[PDB]
Design an enzyme around this catalytic site. Structure first.
Site, PDB file in Angstrom:
ATOM      1  N   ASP C 129      45.482  -7.980 -45.593  1.00 43.67           N
ATOM      2  CA  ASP C 129      44.866  -8.592 -46.683  1.00 43.67           C
ATOM      3  C   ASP C 129      44.070  -8.920 -47.199  1.00 43.67           C
ATOM      4  O   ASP C 129      43.885  -8.365 -48.380  1.00 43.67           O
ATOM      5  CB  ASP C 129      46.381  -7.670 -48.349  1.00 43.67           C
ATOM      6  CG  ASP C 129      46.273  -7.474 -48.685  1.00 43.67           C
ATOM      7  OD1 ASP C 129      44.861  -6.869 -49.244  1.00 43.67           O
ATOM      8  OD2 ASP C 129      46.714  -7.874 -49.571  1.00 43.67           O
ATOM      9  N   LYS C 169      42.784  -4.176 -44.829  1.00 43.50           N
ATOM     10  CA  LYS C 169      41.614  -4.028 -45.914  1.00 43.50           C
ATOM     11  C   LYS C 169      40.398  -4.020 -46.124  1.00 43.50           C
ATOM     12  O   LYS C 169      40.025  -5.154 -45.194  1.00 43.50           O
ATOM     13  CB  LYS C 169      42.524  -5.114 -47.496  1.00 43.50           C
ATOM     14  CG  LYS C 169      41.609  -4.524 -48.540  1.00 43.50           C
ATOM     15  CD  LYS C 169      40.963  -5.461 -48.890  1.00 43.50           C
ATOM     16  CE  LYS C 169      40.349  -5.414 -50.210  1.00 43.50           C
ATOM     17  NZ  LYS C 169      39.391  -6.276 -51.342  1.00 43.50           N
TER      18      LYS C 169
HETATM   19  N1  LIG Z   1      39.382 -15.573 -43.954  1.00 41.24           N
HETATM   20  C1  LIG Z   1      40.283 -15.991 -44.749  1.00 41.24           C
HETATM   21  N2  LIG Z   1      41.097 -16.783 -44.028  1.00 41.24           N
HETATM   22  C2  LIG Z   1      42.413 -17.083 -44.613  1.00 41.24           C
HETATM   23  N3  LIG Z   1      42.799 -16.459 -45.750  1.00 41.24           N
HETATM   24  C3  LIG Z   1      41.867 -15.995 -46.540  1.00 41.24           C
HETATM   25  C4  LIG Z   1      40.333 -15.628 -45.322  1.00 41.24           C
HETATM   26  N4  LIG Z   1      39.794 -14.670 -46.391  1.00 41.24           N
HETATM   27  C5  LIG Z   1      40.391 -14.923 -47.227  1.00 41.24           C
HETATM   28  N5  LIG Z   1      41.790 -15.357 -47.324  1.00 41.24           N
HETATM   29  C6  LIG Z   1      42.806 -15.314 -48.634  1.00 41.24           C
HETATM   30  O1  LIG Z   1      43.489 -13.635 -48.433  1.00 41.24           O
HETATM   31  C7  LIG Z   1      43.610 -13.735 -50.122  1.00 41.24           C
HETATM   32  C8  LIG Z   1      42.440 -12.264 -50.118  1.00 41.24           C
HETATM   33  S1  LIG Z   1      42.187 -12.937 -52.144  1.00 41.24           S
HETATM   34  C9  LIG Z   1      43.505 -11.473 -52.772  1.00 41.24           C
HETATM   35  C10 LIG Z   1      44.689 -10.626 -52.598  1.00 41.24           C
HETATM   36  C11 LIG Z   1      46.051 -11.036 -51.976  1.00 41.24           C
HETATM   37  N6  LIG Z   1      46.493 -11.380 -51.324  1.00 41.24           N
HETATM   38  C12 LIG Z   1      46.611  -9.754 -52.213  1.00 41.24           C
HETATM   39  O2  LIG Z   1      47.895  -9.201 -51.580  1.00 41.24           O
HETATM   40  O3  LIG Z   1      46.461  -8.412 -53.092  1.00 41.24           O
HETATM   41  C13 LIG Z   1      43.449 -15.222 -50.578  1.00 41.24           C
HETATM   42  O4  LIG Z   1      44.661 -15.218 -50.744  1.00 41.24           O
HETATM   43  C14 LIG Z   1      41.963 -15.449 -50.069  1.00 41.24           C
HETATM   44  O5  LIG Z   1      42.210 -16.674 -49.926  1.00 41.24           O
END
Ligand SMILES: Nc1ncnc2c1ncn2[C@@H]1O[C@H](CSCC[C@H](N)C(=O)O)[C@@H](O)[C@H]1O
Ligand SMILES: [Mg+2]
Ligand SMILES: [Mg+2]
Ligand SMILES: [Mg+2]
Ligand SMILES: [Mg+2]
Ligand SMILES: [Mg+2]
Ligand SMILES: [Mg+2]
Ligand SMILES: [Mg+2]
Ligand SMILES: [Mg+2]
Ligand SMILES: [Mg+2]
Ligand SMILES: [Mg+2]
Ligand SMILES: [Mg+2]
Ligand SMILES: [Mg+2]
Ligand SMILES: [Mg+2]
Ligand SMILES: [Mg+2]
Ligand SMILES: [Mg+2]
Ligand SMILES: [Mg+2]
Ligand SMILES: [Mg+2]
Ligand SMILES: [Mg+2]
Ligand SMILES: [Mg+2]
Ligand SMILES: [Mg+2]
Ligand SMILES: [Mg+2]
Ligand SMILES: [Mg+2]
Ligand SMILES: [Mg+2]
Ligand SMILES: [Mg+2]
Ligand SMILES: [Mg+2]
Ligand SMILES: [Mg+2]
Ligand SMILES: [Mg+2]
Ligand SMILES: [Mg+2]
Ligand SMILES: [Mg+2]
Ligand SMILES: [Mg+2]
Ligand SMILES: [Mg+2]
Ligand SMILES: [Mg+2]
Ligand SMILES: [Mg+2]
Ligand SMILES: [Mg+2]
Ligand SMILES: [Mg+2]
Ligand SMILES: [Mg+2]
Ligand SMILES: [Mg+2]
Ligand SMILES: [Mg+2]
Ligand SMILES: [Mg+2]
Ligand SMILES: [Mg+2]
Ligand SMILES: [Mg+2]
Ligand SMILES: [Mg+2]
Ligand SMILES: [Mg+2]
Ligand SMILES: [Mg+2]
Ligand SMILES: [Mg+2]
Ligand SMILES: [Mg+2]
Ligand SMILES: [Mg+2]
Ligand SMILES: [Mg+2]
Ligand SMILES: [Mg+2]
Ligand SMILES: [Mg+2]
Ligand SMILES: [Mg+2]
Ligand SMILES: [Mg+2]
Ligand SMILES: [Mg+2]
Ligand SMILES: [Mg+2]
Ligand SMILES: [Mg+2]
Ligand SMILES: [Mg+2]
Ligand SMILES: [Mg+2]
Lengths: 31, 102, 214
Positions: C129, C169
RNA sequence: GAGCUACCUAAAAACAAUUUUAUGAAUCAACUCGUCUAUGUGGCAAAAUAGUGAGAAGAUUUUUAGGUAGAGGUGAAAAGCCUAACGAGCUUGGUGAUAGCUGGUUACCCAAAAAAUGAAUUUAAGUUCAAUUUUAAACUUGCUAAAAAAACAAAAUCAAAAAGUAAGUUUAGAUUAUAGCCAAAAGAGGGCUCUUCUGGAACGGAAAAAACCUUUAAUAGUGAAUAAUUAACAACAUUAACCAUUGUAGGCCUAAAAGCAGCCACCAAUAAAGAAAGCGUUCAAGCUCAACAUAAAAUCAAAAUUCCAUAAUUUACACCAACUUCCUAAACUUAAAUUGGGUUAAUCUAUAACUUUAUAGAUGCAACACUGUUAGUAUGAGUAACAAGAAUUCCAAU
RNA sequence: CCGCCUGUUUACCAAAAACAUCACCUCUAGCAUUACAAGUAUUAGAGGCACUGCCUGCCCAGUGA
RNA sequence: CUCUUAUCUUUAAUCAGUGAAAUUGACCUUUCAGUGAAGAGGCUGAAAUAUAAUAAUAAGACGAGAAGACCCUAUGGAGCUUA
RNA sequence: UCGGAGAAAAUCCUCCGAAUGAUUAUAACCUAGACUUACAAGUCAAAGUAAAAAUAUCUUUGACCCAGAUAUUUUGAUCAACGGACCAAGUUACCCUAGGGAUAAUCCUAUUUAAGAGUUCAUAUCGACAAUUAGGGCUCUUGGAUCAGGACAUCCCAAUGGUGUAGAAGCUAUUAAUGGUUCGUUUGUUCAACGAUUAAAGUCCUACGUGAUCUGAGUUCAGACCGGAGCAAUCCAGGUCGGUUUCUAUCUAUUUACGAUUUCUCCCAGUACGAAAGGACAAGAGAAAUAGAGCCACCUUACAAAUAAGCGCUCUCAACUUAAUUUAUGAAUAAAAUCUAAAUAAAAUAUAUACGUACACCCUCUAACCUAGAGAAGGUUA
């Protein structure tokens, strides 16, 4: 906050205030 | 709230045709023969329009009048005949050699 | 001091039925619903499976999984299942879950940790996600997301088990075609699924692909 | 009432060009419909115009004549349509339908007068009864006050005798009203909300000013004495001057804790010195206080448009100000639904009068107001809006 | 995403995901001189419902047989 | 759109002809502070102030026409469904 | 509906009970005078007469009409909506008429107090218990555009005091309203967040400041679907898609100048300061950006016109009058004291109008022309 007094009551307090008597000669300037 | 319009509010109306003044324009050259003055920049009004010229009233140029003719310039005196063209030192006159930025 | 754009966003949040629903149903955020609706129509999650959830924070999707795969283990008869959460942000503890926060999936050392902890070194289904922080430039934001998804496919060979599923996603754009090309090769078929809980104005879309082979 | 519209019956009619085929196919005119936007909004139009759009050989569109009628008809159901206004057409009659609801209800003068508490009600937007008020009549005690002596528990009843004073009961008739408001007291549910006692409704005063204060009715006067009356006149009334020696750094796990971390004792010399009232030192040092002599003074109080009468500290105890009260002449005393009484405008009839009158009998008997009805004339306004191609030798001409 | 498709609808604020529709299914009826119909169960009327294939198909009375 | 500009036609303005509509208690129709029923052109206190037209803006006159909608009442109605 | 207890004669105020039952040696008829009470209903009782050898105590329902029973006397209601219609439920967003409304706590800021934090040390910086005639914010109208008027409780620019201030950065307090205070975007986040910048991206009041200037949601309906209810019609402070407010301006008010803000580079100087690391004042110079006022030699865009425009070019300044604060002379107060709501002398923000620029003329007019113009006015005429 003090509840306001009816103007008639306010007039009563103004007329009955304490008045002290005053001496003719101040003691310090006397011998 | 005020239930009125403040005096001086900006609204449609006739524009232009008003007296305006431009400050601090340098004089670059004078032509004695035809009585022509060259002034830096722009001057208000259309061509063929009469203008009023007087020396600057800005704080910097307070007492520059001493060098210039004090009452006025009289050619009737005829002490010396002036050159046809008067220039400023920084001006590059025509007929001079081409400028080389040495 | 709030600009019109900020005001419009908040009003949509206030009237949202799903956000209210999660509060009533003890779900951490609206997102969990998207997974539940998709699961009903595709039965992606079943008891006894091993699941890997990426971008868990806040952790709403994890709560959905633990119930389904019987990770809680309350139902003794039901086959137990495993759920894992990976997210950069910290995750407050949940029952029957393991949270590797803070960790970045891109980093190599994280990968070794995942392999050791996962049951028998393989995970049946991988749930992703993750979305990058939105800069506000369509191409820039979209491009990085597609790159993040592509790297996940590259590591899918090592962790994903044959016959597994992948749900990711993504955002639409000019590079979506490449994503279709890769997923086609590894898996038999792929589906473009947009839930009703996912907002209509958003360009977000999902990919469901199953039956991993080589 | 099916000349609009819905559906049906009979007799008639239209469909180019191009690609497919062999068709509720395709492109796109005629023709039918009406997606989207702007203009328009007493509009060209009581649903249009300008663009842009859907179908266009079919469940297609169109013409003429006939059919189904309101407790009904018709409906590829929109509770759609049935002559511009159909959850049920229109016209006449029943009909002056009914309306506890809204609006209106036409001359003068004098007099009296409310509370708007209690009870019942498919009752609380209404009504009936008590209570109040009131006109008339009969005849006799009323109002204020009220000792003791009770009844109460540890100011409301009750009403002798007196005094100041003029009302009160019974009989007969009659409506209206049945939501109040503010000030000042005492409570009760905790600023509201109820219950109880008192007062008010300026033409003067408090800045304007229903409810606070002065004020017994209402008349003429170029008289007079007074009432209420937003202003009032920031400190003081035990110390400032000079100093410091010691038994010993007092014990105490505290290294040490020395006047000062403690901890108990707290003594000593000296004129005068706390085993110290503070600082400060790792502890110590060091700085002070009190002591030594030497001096001197003397308690609470008068924020967002633009500031807002003008000004002023000393002349001797008054003046000014309401029909309140007095004076000349008169008068005979305090908002309003409702209630009791004296006059009168106009017209007709009887009998009179004769430049418009009298006594009686009568009535379609009186309008500054019902988004009243009819007619007239303003305002907006000389405003919005409306219109004829050119020259000539001429408008059935060139 | 919804509806199979061409079609229809609130004349004057809604043309659509609604209504109809081929296909499929249920119920009622053995008969003539004005509708149905000058017709007769492969017919007529009323109503529901996308079609297509594809898994899931079980109140036969039990055991012997 | 950044960020607007130029030209022509219609409108507009002046002259000639014809000539409506909603609206209207009377008006000799000012600003600021205060008072007040979130409220003052008209009341209290200050201040300003020769008389009339023509062309423009829309803050106020709780601006005009709203058959415009929400809440309540009536021993006022009508359509629909039933057990 | 009726009765009992508290408040105490009010209440939707605080509580309990009643629509009877038990025992009765059986309680007659007649009749002065009273209580209670709107009406209706309900209480008590002398004398007389009569049976016997006088009262049964416990202590609470229902009118009239209309039907009963028997041999003349009696009996019929959770009519409990309890002054009682002989007998009748839902629903309306498809809706109609008559009207009436309408449309203390919390918490933060400022003062007082001062245990404890601060290695030591109450008040550099904070700060318990409290104190504050202290300020100001089971449910269910706001955004944007345009143009802004104003307050100071100041975000930036400006003048200052203290520091646990070496320099550079910072933390705190006083004074001042001068002009300014950016551009894009939603995966998660109960009135939030993210990207790039800036000297700064201030807090508030003005019937959402502002809809007879414009526009998007919602208030909210006529169509239609899902989810949950109801036998149904329908319903929901639940999801979603579609969806009608017009104005010609009568009155007030208003429509023709001014004397500038900020940032960056260089220079002072890699200096002052500091063990080093590091790293400035002030004074001087040059560049820009925005704001205001004009203009057309060039460039660019139009009229395929002699002109109008910006994307082109030019010009922008003085302080008489002050506040926080800091110095000098000096009494009250014996000094070598003291900036002084003592008599005196100076320096020092933002403001502004003492001081300048601009304007000044008295005016012919058939008509024509004009870089002047809606009309009128104004300018020009071998
Ligand atoms: N490359 C990456 N590696 C690890 N975590 C990441 C990432 N890109 C984004 N994330 C993390 O994943 C989340 C995506 S944004 C929020 C979406 C949320 N997980 C939901 O359930 O809708 C954030 O917490 C962000 O810090
Ligand atoms: Mg005003
Ligand atoms: Mg979005
Ligand atoms: Mg016909
Ligand atoms: Mg016809
Ligand atoms: Mg053809
Ligand atoms: Mg049609
Ligand atoms: Mg087509
Ligand atoms: Mg077509
Ligand atoms: Mg065709
Ligand atoms: Mg329907
Ligand atoms: Mg309907
Ligand atoms: Mg009709
Ligand atoms: Mg009537
Ligand atoms: Mg009363
Ligand atoms: Mg009754
Ligand atoms: Mg009533
Ligand atoms: Mg007596
Ligand atoms: Mg009198
Ligand atoms: Mg009267
Ligand atoms: Mg009459
Ligand atoms: Mg009238
Ligand atoms: Mg006229
Ligand atoms: Mg006009
Ligand atoms: Mg005009
Ligand atoms: Mg015109
Ligand atoms: Mg013509
Ligand atoms: Mg369809
Ligand atoms: Mg179609
Ligand atoms: Mg039809
Ligand atoms: Mg329509
Ligand atoms: Mg369509
Ligand atoms: Mg339409
Ligand atoms: Mg359908
Ligand atoms: Mg004319
Ligand atoms: Mg006037
Ligand atoms: Mg005012
Ligand atoms: Mg006035
Ligand atoms: Mg206005
Ligand atoms: Mg206008
Ligand atoms: Mg109005
Ligand atoms: Mg009633
Ligand atoms: Mg009725
Ligand atoms: Mg009736
Ligand atoms: Mg007796
Ligand atoms: Mg009753
Ligand atoms: Mg009753
Ligand atoms: Mg509906
Ligand atoms: Mg402003
Ligand atoms: Mg300040
Ligand atoms: Mg407005
Ligand atoms: Mg549409
Ligand atoms: Mg809508
Ligand atoms: Mg809607
Ligand atoms: Mg005007
Ligand atoms: Mg410098
Ligand atoms: Mg001295
Ligand atoms: Mg000194």
């Amino acid at each position: 906050h003090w509840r306001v007094m009816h103007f008639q009551r306010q007039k009563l307090m103004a007329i009955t205030e304490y008045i002290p008597p005053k001496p003719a000669i101040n003691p310090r300037c006397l011998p | 709230d005020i239930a009125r319009v403040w005096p001086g509010t900006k609204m449609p109306g006739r524009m232009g045709n008003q007296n305006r003044t431009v400050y601090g324009l340098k004089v670059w050259r004078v032509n004695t023969k035809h009585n022509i003055i060259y002034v830096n920049g722009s001057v208000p009004g259309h061509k063929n329009c009469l203008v009023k010229i007087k020396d600057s009233t800005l704080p910097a140029y307070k007492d520059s009048c001493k060098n210039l003719p004090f009452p006025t310039y009289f050619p009737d005196g005829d002490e010396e005949e002036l050159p046809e063209d008067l220039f400023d030192e920084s001006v590059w006159q025509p007929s001079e050699p081409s400028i080389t930025f040495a | 001091g709030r600009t019109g754009a900020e005001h419009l966003w908040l009003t949509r949040h206030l009237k949202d039925p799903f956000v209210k629903a999660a509060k009533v149903e003890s779900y951490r955020c609206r997102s969990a619903f998207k997974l539940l609706e998709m699961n009903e129509k595709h039965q992606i999650l079943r008891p006894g499976l091993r699941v890997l959830d990426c971008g868990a924070a806040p952790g709403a999707w994890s709560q959905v999984a633990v119930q389904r795969v019987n990770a809680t283990g309350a139902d003794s008869s039901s086959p137990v299942g495993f759920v894992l959460g990976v997210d950069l942000l910290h995750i407050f503890p949940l029952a029957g879950a393991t949270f590797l926060c803070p960790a970045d999936v891109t980093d190599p050392r994280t990968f070794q940790k995942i392999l050791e902890l996962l049951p028998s070194r393989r995970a049946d289904v991988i749930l992703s996600d993750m979305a990058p922080n939105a800069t506000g430039i369509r191409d820039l934001d979209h491009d990085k997301l597609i790159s993040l998804c592509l790297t996940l496919v590259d590591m899918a060979v090592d962790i994903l088990h044959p016959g597994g599923t992948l749900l990711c996603k993504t955002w639409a754009g000019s590079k979506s075609h490449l994503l279709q090309k890769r997923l086609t090769q590894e898996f038999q078929s792929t589906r473009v699924v947009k839930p009703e809980a996912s907002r209509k104005e958003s360009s977000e879309v999902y990919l469901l692909a199953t039956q991993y082979r080589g």
